[PDB]
Write a protein that binds this ligand. Structure first.
Ligand SMILES: Nc1ncnc2c1ncn2[C@@H]1O[C@H](COP(=O)(O)OP(=O)(O)CP(=O)(O)O)[C@@H](O)[C@H]1O
Ligand SMILES: Nc1ncnc2c1ncn2[C@@H]1O[C@H](COP(=O)(O)OP(=O)(O)CP(=O)(O)O)[C@@H](O)[C@H]1O
Ligand SMILES: Nc1ncnc2c1ncn2[C@@H]1O[C@H](COP(=O)(O)OP(=O)(O)CP(=O)(O)O)[C@@H](O)[C@H]1O
Ligand SMILES: O=c1ccn([C@@H]2O[C@H](COP(=O)(O)OP(=O)(O)OP(=O)(O)O)[C@@H](O)[C@H]2O)c(=O)[nH]1
Ligand SMILES: O=c1ccn([C@@H]2O[C@H](COP(=O)(O)OP(=O)(O)OP(=O)(O)O)[C@@H](O)[C@H]2O)c(=O)[nH]1
Ligand SMILES: O=c1ccn([C@@H]2O[C@H](COP(=O)(O)OP(=O)(O)OP(=O)(O)O)[C@@H](O)[C@H]2O)c(=O)[nH]1
Ligand SMILES: NC(=O)CC[C@H](N)C(=O)O
Ligand SMILES: NC(=O)CC[C@H](N)C(=O)O
Ligand SMILES: NC(=O)CC[C@H](N)C(=O)O
Lengths: 556, 556, 556
C-alpha cells in the first residue's frame, strides 16, 4: 500500500480536509481504490458527547458511529462508506493499550509511549487501510489526515509514529503533504512566508520532510513567493502548490490536476498510472464546477435552526441543498433564521429582531427545520411549521422538525395546547413524543437508534415515495431516541396527516406528509448523510423543486 | 502546602530516589510532616505484571498495591505508610480522564492533553498531598519525584503540568531540584559539565528553572566546576550541591545538611524552621552513618535466588539484612548464589560452576531463600533447604522458601519423591502446595492475598514469637496465591516441623519452624517491607544472630 | 568530491580527532587521496594568541599559520602538509563576509546568516577540498571535523550549512559520522544509552541523520546495547561502531577496518575500491600496533616544562618521543617535572616537593627541555641544563632550552651571573638573547620567524648532522622572535660550545652542541612537528639512543 500523510501548519482550519479529499478523488478518477483516515488528537472515543458549536455537525456512519465531519467530506468526494476504525483518536489508542496491558498481552515488560503507543498507531493504520471500503475491493492508497498543527503537544505521538512509518514502509510507498497559510496583511500589503518557514522548520525538527507544500492564501500569489518557498524549504518549484480562495470546492481537484500533482505522485509513489487514459476522467467535476458558475435563478431557502450562529453546524444540510440546487440548475441562497428569535419572549425584548427574522422567514420560497438536541428554541420551530402549514409554504423537517410538526398539528388541530415531548417537560398531561430506545430497554448495548436502518413504505400514493424512485424500502441513517406516540396515531391521522413510512415492525413512524399541502414532508432520519455531489437526496430535491414550483412537472 | 519537584538529567539511574528521601528526612527531622509522590511516566496502572529484571523488586503497600521500589525508599527514610494514589502513572491519568469523558463529566466539550490531562495531574497531586499519611496529621511538604529524564516524550504532560503548577501555587510555595551527572572520562581525565548544561537548557526550554542543581559524580569535584555550573546555569555558588559516591546512603542527608540546604529551603519556601532547635535532630543518622564505618566482624549470608544477576531485584531484602547487621554491629558480606547452578543439569554442563556455587553456599554462615514467581530454579532452593537442614545451618525463607522447605521436608522425610506444588506440575499425584485465592473463589475482586493481614501465633514456645516481642499477633504484608496443603498438615507435623503462625481462620499456615534445628524459620509473608533502618525485622535479626552464634544469648 | 562530516555528541573531548584521522588513513591506504578540514566554532582567526592550557599545544604549519593540534593528528596520520585555509573558524567567516559587504560585493542586498554565511562556509569547504595537499594530486575525499557538540549556539551556522550541503552535493557524495559517549557509572554498573539518544535527537532536529554512530566507551559493550542504539537511532546493526579505550591509537584504524567500515563506505559513497587489492595495505599499522605491545625496555625521559599540569600541552613532543622509542624498540616512560619546583624558592616553602622533583630528574636516563613563552619557570630550566652538563646526562632543548642552555653556559663558564634574555629583564647589563624580528623591523608583516625555513650546516663533524643523514641543509618549522646574541658568539664558542647550524645569512644560530658531552644538542626550531609515526625526528631519535647508550653504535 501507499500512504499520503496530510499535515497542517500555521493554524487549524486552513483546508486539509478538502486538500485530502481532492487527492483522493484525483487518485480515484485515475483508476485506483482509495481509502481515508482522520486522526483527531483529542481524548474522545467518538463525537457522541459533542455539541455542534465544538466541531461542526457530528456525522454518522452506517455502523452507528458518531465521528467528525471530515469523514463526511471523504464520503462525499470519494463515494465510499467508511467505518468506525477510520477515525483514530488519542483516547482509542491509549484505551486499547491500557486494556492490553491490564490483560497481560505486554507480558512482563514496561509499556511506554515509544515504542508501544506508536506501534499501536502503526498497526491500526495498516490494518485499517486494508479493510474493503467500497465493497470487496482492497485499497491501494490510504490518505491519512493528521488534525491539528505540527508543534502541539497533542500530536507528537503521531508525528513520531509516522517518522518511523516512513522507514517501515520503504519511502517509495510514502508521501507527506504540508498545508500552510500565507497571510497577506492589509498594512504591509505583501504576502508573508515566515509562518510557513517556521512550520516547515518545526516539522523537519520532528524527522519529517515535506514533498509537497500546499500554500493556502486568500488571493493568488506570484512566482516570487513560490520560489522563495522552494528555496527556504528545499522543495522544487513545481511541487509547491498554490491554492487561493476559489468560488466553490469542486475547483480544488481541478486546480491541483492543472498544477501537475497527478504526474508528480505517479512518479513519486510509482503507481503505474497510464497517462494516455487518465484524460477525461474529471469530466463530471469540470461539468459540476461549471454549473457552479452558470446558474442564476436565486432560489431562497430558510434554515430554521438553533445553532445558526455557526455555518459549520449544518455542513451536510447546506451541502445537500447545494447538490440538489445544482441538479435543478438554480443558485441557492440560504438565510439562517434563529428559532429563538421567533418566540414572543423576544417581542417583549427586541421587537425589531422579532419582526426582522419573521420577515426573513416570510419572504422565502421554502423552509427547512433541521434536527438538534435539547429544548432551547423548539417553540420557534413549531411556530414556523404552523406558519408554513397555514400559508402553503413548503417545509422539510429532519428528526426534530418532524416532532415539532406533529406537535404543531396536535396543538393547532386537536386544540391540545399541552401537546409536547417527554423531553421538554416530562410530567406533561399530553405527550406526543415518547422514548422508544432500540434495545436499551433490556440492556445497555444499543440505546439510541444509531446507524443505517430500513424503512418500508405504507400503502398510498406519496410524493416522497415517488421521489425515492417508487421503491418498497430505503436504508437511511438514524440518530434519535424519541418517537411519535403510537396512541395519538389515529387522533392525528383522522386529519390532514399521513404516515407513509415505517419500520418492519410498524411501531415507528418516520415519514409523514400532509394532505392538500404541496410539500410538507418530514423525516425522522437524516437524508443529508447520503447526499453526494452527483446524487442529491430525494427529499431535498423535492423541497427545491416545490420551492420553485416545478415538482409536479418533474414527477410527470 | 509546599512542593519540591525533583527532576533528572543526563541519565536515569543517577540517584533521585535518595536525593528526595534525603530532602524528606531533613524536613522531617526539623519538625515537619512530609509526604511523597512518585511519577512513573510508563503506561502501567501498577507493577503487578512486572518482572524484577524490569524495575527492581516490586514493592507492596498496606492496602494491597504493587508499586515501584522508590516508595520503599520513601517509607524506609521517612517512616510513613503511603497509599496507592501516591504512585502516579500515565495510564492512571489517561484512564481516569477517559472514564470521565465516556460518562459525561466533561459535558459537550473537547478533551485535550492541555488543559485537561494537566488539570487531572494537578488535582491528583493536590488531593494526594493532603491525605494524612502518618496517622491523622496533615502534611505540610510534598516531595514529587518525576521519573525519567527531562526531554523524553513520555514526561512532557507532567513537565507542562508543573510549569502551570508553579504559577497556580504562588512560587513561594514551590521548589525544583535538578539532579544531573558530571561524567569524568578516563581519557580526558577531567570532569565534563556539558551534559548538565544541555539538560538545564532543555529544562528551561520547557518553562522551568532550577533552584538547586545536585551534581552526581563518582569522585568529588572542585570549586572550578561548581562555579562553572553556577555561571552556565544562573544559579548561585551555594545552591549547587555536589554529591559524590559515598560509602553508604545514610551519608547523603548529612552531606546535604552540611552544604546548607536546610537553611536555603527554610529561606526559599518560608517554612519557619527555628534554627536554634534544629540542632541535634539528625543525631540518629550520624550514629548510623558512623556505625557503617565502625563495624568489622564479617558476617556472611547466602542469598539463594534466581534473579541474582541483578542486585536491585532484592533491594528490600538486602537493606533489611543491612539494618539487622548494623543493629548487631557486624559488617555484612553478601554472596549471591544463583539457584539454577545448584542442580545437576549444570553438573552435566559445567561442573566448575556447580562446585564453585556449592562451595560458596557451603562456606557461608547463613542462608536466605527469597521469594519469587514461576518454576525456573526452584529445585536448587529445595537442595539448599535440605543442605541447611542436614548441616545445622541457619535458614530463612520468604513466601517461596517456605514452600520449598515444606517440599524438601516431604520428599526427604516422607519419601514422597513426587512432592511438589500445583504450579510446577499441576497433574502431580502428591501436591503439598495448592491455590487458596483469598476471595477470587466467588468473584474477581481479590484473587491474591495482597496487602497487610493479621497472623496469630499458635500455642507453643517459638523463637520467632520471642523475637517479635512475644505478641499475640502481627500485621504483615502478603503477596501470594498458594498455600501449604491442609491435609498433609499432620503428615509433616508428626515430625521435625511446627506451625506456630496462622490466620484467624486457622486454615493458612504462614510461620513454620523445625524442631532441633538452631534456626530454620520460614514465613509466607514479606517481613522485609517493614524493616526500617532504625527498626530491623525480627526474622532477619534472628537470622543474623544465629548466624554468628549469639541468638540464644540475645534472648536470655 | 566526497565528504565525510564528523560530529560530536555528549561531550567535547571524546575522540573525533582520532576517528577522523582513522577514516583518513583507511581511505588513504585503499589508494585514495584524502584531505581534511577542522571547524573550530570559536571567534579566533588563529591560535597565535593562545596559551597551551586552553587548547593544547598550538601547532604550526609550513606557511606560518598557528592552528589547533588536531591538524597535527591529520598530518601525522595521513602524511600531508595542510595549509591555513584548512582551519575554519567563525571569525574567519564573519570577517570575510563583513569585508565583502563593506567593499560592495553583496551589492544592494541584505546580508544575513542564512543564506550568506552558510554560502561562504560551503564555498570555503569546496574551494579548500580541491587544493593539492600532497604535491599536485587533487583530493578525492575530504574529512570535515566539526568541533564542539551538536546543540550549542556556536555551531548552528555550520550545521545549517551542511544540512544544505547534503542536498547541494547529491547525498551519494556525502556521509555523516556521529561520535557519542556511552557512560558506564559505577553505581548502576550498566552502560547508559540515553545521552546518545538525546544527541541523535538534537541532531535530527537540525536536519541531519547519521549514517554511522561511533560509540566511545571505556570498556567494550555488548550486542544488547548495540541493537538498542540501532533501534533508537534507525541505523542498522552493522553501522554502529563500538570503540573502547585501547592501548594506543594505532589500534583505532584496525578496530574500524575489522568492523567493516571500509566496505560500508565503498558501498555508500561509491568510491570504486577494488576489494581484492585492499588487503595488506594496513600492514605497516599492524606492525606498529604490535610493536606497541612487544616492547619492554623502560627508557625513561624527563620533560622539564612549565605547563606540566597538562599532558596535552606537549602532544607533539610526547608523540615524537613515542615514535622514536618505537623505532628503537623501547617502552617509553615519561616523567613530567615542573620547572618551577626546581628553584630554591620552593625549597624555602616545601623542601619535600623540591627534593622529590630533583630526585625524579636525577634518576632519569635523559632530559628534554621543551619550548614555551614568558618568564615563569625558566630558572629551573637553566638549573636542569647545568645539572645535565655537569653529570654527563643527555639533553635536548627546543627553542627555549637552547636559550636556557646558552644562558647556563654563560653564567657558569664565563661567570656572567647577570647573563639573561631581553625578555625576563630588559634593562640587564649582559644580554645573551636579543630580539631579531624577521622583517617586522621595517614593517608589520612578518614579526615572528614563523613557518618552515632553511638551516644550513656549518663545517665540522657533528652528531646531529650525522643523524639527519649528513645533508647540507634542512627545512624546519620555526616559531620564535629572540636569538642568540651575535657578539657573545666567540665569548661562548672559545669553550665547550659549537654552533653547527645557521641560516643562509650566518647571523642566526639555531643548532648548538657541546664538546665532550655525549649528547647536548639544542635546536631553535621545533623538530617535533615533522615527526610522523613511520618517520621519527633525528634529534629525538638520537636523544633516545644516547639515553640507552646505543647512539655511537647506531652511527657506526
Ligand atoms: N481552497 C478553498 N477554497 C475555497 N473554500 C475552501 C477552500 N478550502 C477550504 N474551503 C472551505 O473552508 C472550509 C475549511 O474546512 P476544512 O475541513 O477543509 O479545513 P480544517 O483545517 O478545518 C480540517 P481539520 O478540522 O481536521 O483541521 C472547507 O470546508 C471549505 O468549505
Ligand atoms: N550519592 C550516592 N552515594 C552512594 N550511593 C548512591 C548514591 N545515590 C544513589 N546511590 C545508590 O544507587 C542507587 C540508585 O538508585 P536511585 O533510585 O537512587 O536513582 P534512580 O535514578 O534509579 C530513581 P528512578 O528509577 O525513579 O529514576 C540507590 O539506590 C543507592 O543505593
Ligand atoms: N579510542 C581511543 N582509544 C584510546 N585513546 C584514545 C581514543 N580516542 C582518543 N584517544 C586519546 O584521547 C585524546 C582525545 O583527544 P581527541 O582530539 O581525539 O578528541 P576531541 O574531542 O578533543 C577533538 P576536538 O577538540 O576538536 O573536539 C586523543 O588524542 C587520544 O590520545
Ligand atoms: O526589521 C527587521 C526585519 C528583518 N531584519 C532582517 O532582514 C531579513 C528580512 O527577512 P523578513 O523577516 O523581513 O521576511 P522573509 O524574507 O524571511 O519572509 P517574508 O515574511 O517576507 O515572506 C531577515 O533575515 C532579518 O534578519 C532586520 O534586520 N530588521
Ligand atoms: O574542539 C573544540 C572544542 C571546543 N571548541 C569551542 O571552545 C569552547 C570549549 O568548551 P568545551 O565544549 O570544550 O567544554 P565546556 O567549557 O563547555 O564544559 P566542559 O565540558 O569542559 O565541562 C566551546 O565553546 C567550543 O565552541 C572548539 O572550537 N573546538
Ligand atoms: O524511574 C523511572 C525510570 C524510567 N521510567 C520509564 O521506563 C523507561 C526506561 O528507560 P530508561 O530511561 O531507564 O533507559 P533507556 O532504556 O531509555 O536507555 P539506557 O539509559 O538504559 O541506556 C523509560 O521510558 C521511562 O519512561 C520510569 O517510569 N521511571
Ligand atoms: N438529531 C436530533 O435532532 C435529535 C432529536 C431528538 N433528541 C430525538 O432523539 O428524536
Ligand atoms: N512472592 C513469591 O515468592 C510468590 C510465590 C508463589 N507464587 C506464591 O504465591 O506463594
Ligand atoms: N616557542 C618558544 O619556546 C618561544 C621562546 C621565545 N619566546 C622565543 O621566541 O625564542
Amino acid at each position: 500500500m501507499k500512504y499520503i500523510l496530510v499535515t497542517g501548519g500555521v493554524i487549524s482550519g486552513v483546508g486539509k480536509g478538502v486538500i485530502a479529499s481532492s487527492f483522493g478523488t484525483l487518485l480515484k478518477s485515475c483508476g485506483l481504490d482509495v481509502t481515508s483516515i482522520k486522526i483527531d488528537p483529542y481524548i474522545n472515543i467518538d463525537a457522541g458527547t459533542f455539541s455542534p458549536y465544538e466541531h461542526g455537525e457530528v456525522y454518522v456512519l452506517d455502523d452507528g458511529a458518531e465521528v467528525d465531519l471530515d469523514l463526511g467530506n471523504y464520503e462525499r468526494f470519494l463515494d465510499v462508506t467508511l467505518h468506525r476504525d477510520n477515525n483514530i483518536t488519542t483516547g482509542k489508542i491509549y484505551k486499547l493499550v491500557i486494556e492490553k496491558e491490564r490483560t497481560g498481552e505486554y507480558l512482563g515488560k514496561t509499556v511506554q509511549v515509544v515504542p508501544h503507543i506508536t506501534d499501536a498507531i502503526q498497526e491500526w493504520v495498516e490494518r485499517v487501510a486494508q479493510t474493503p471500503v467500497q465493497g470487496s475491493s482492497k485499497p491501494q492508497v490510504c490518505i491519512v489526515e493528521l488534525g491539528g498543527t505540527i508543534g502541539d503537544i497533542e500530536g507528537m505521538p503521531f508525528v513520531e509514529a509516522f517518522r518511523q512509518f516512513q522507514f517501515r514502509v520503504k519511502r517509495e510507498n510514502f508521501c507527506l503533504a504540508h498545508v500552510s497559510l500565507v497571510p497577506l496583511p492589509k498594512a504591509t500589503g505583501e504576502p508573508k512566508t515566515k509562518p510557513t518557514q517556521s512550520s516547515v522548520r518545526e516539522l523537519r525538527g520532528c524527522g519529517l520532510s515535506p514533498d509537497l507544500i500546499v500554500c493556502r492564501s486568500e488571493k493568488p500569489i506570484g512566482l516570487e513567493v513560490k520560489e522563495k518557498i522552494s528555496n527556504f524549504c528545499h522543495v522544487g518549484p513545481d511541487q509547491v502548490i498554490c491554492i487561493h480562495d476559489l468560488n466553490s470546492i469542486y475547483h480544488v481537484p481541478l486546480l491541483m490536476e492543472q498544477n501537475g500533482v497527478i504526474e508528480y505522485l505517479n512518479e513519486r509513489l510509482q503507481l503505474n498510472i497510464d497517462m494516455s487514459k487518465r484524460t477525461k476522467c474529471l469530466q463530471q467535476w469540470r461539468d459540476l464546477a461549471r454549473r457552479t458558475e452558470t446558474v442564476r435563478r436565486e432560489v431562497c431557502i430558510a434554515v430554521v435552526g438553533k445553532y445558526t450562529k455557526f455555518t459549520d453546524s449544518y455542513a451536510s444540510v447546506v451541502k445537500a441543498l447545494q447538490h440538489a440546487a445544482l441538479a435543478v440548475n438554480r443558485k441557492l441562497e440560504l438565510v439562517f433564521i434563529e428559532s429563538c428569535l421567533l418566540e414572543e419572549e423576544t417581542l417583549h425584548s427586541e421587537p425589531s429582531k422579532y419582526h426582522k427574522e419573521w420577515q426573513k422567514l416570510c419572504d422565502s420560497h421554502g423552509i427547512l427545520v433541521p434536527g438538534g438536541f435539547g429544548s432551547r428554541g423548539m417553540e420557534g420551530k413549531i411556530r414556523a411549521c404552523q406558519w408554513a402549514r397555514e400559508n402553503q409554504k413548503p417545509l422539510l423537517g429532519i428528526c426534530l422538525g418532524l416532532q415539532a410538526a406533529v406537535i404543531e398539528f396536535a396543538r393547532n388541530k386537536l386544540g391540545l395546547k399541552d401537546a409536547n415531548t417527554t423531553e421538554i417537560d416530562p410530567n406533561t398531561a399530553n405527550a406526543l413524543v415518547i422514548d422508544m430506545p432500540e434495545h436499551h430497554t433490556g440492556q445497555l448495548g444499543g440505546t439510541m437508534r444509531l446507524g443505517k436502518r430500513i424503512t418500508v413504505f405504507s400503502d398510498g400514493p406519496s410524493v416522497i415515495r415517488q421521489l425515492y424512485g417508487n421503491p418498497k424500502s430505503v436504508q437511511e441513517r438514524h440518530r434519535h431516541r424519541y418517537e411519535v406516540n403510537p396512541k395519538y396515531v389515529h387522533l392525528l391521522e383522522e386529519q390532514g396527516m399521513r404516515f407513509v413510512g415505517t419500520d418492519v415492525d410498524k411501531t415507528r413512524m418516520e415519514i409523514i406528509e400532509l394532505s392538500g399541502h404541496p410539500y410538507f414532508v418530514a423525516t425522522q432520519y437524516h437524508p443529508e448523510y447520503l447526499s453526494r455531489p452527483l446524487k442529491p437526496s430525494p427529499p431535498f430535491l423535492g423541497l427545491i423543486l416545490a420551492s420553485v414550483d416545478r415538482l409536479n412537472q418533474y414527477i410527470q
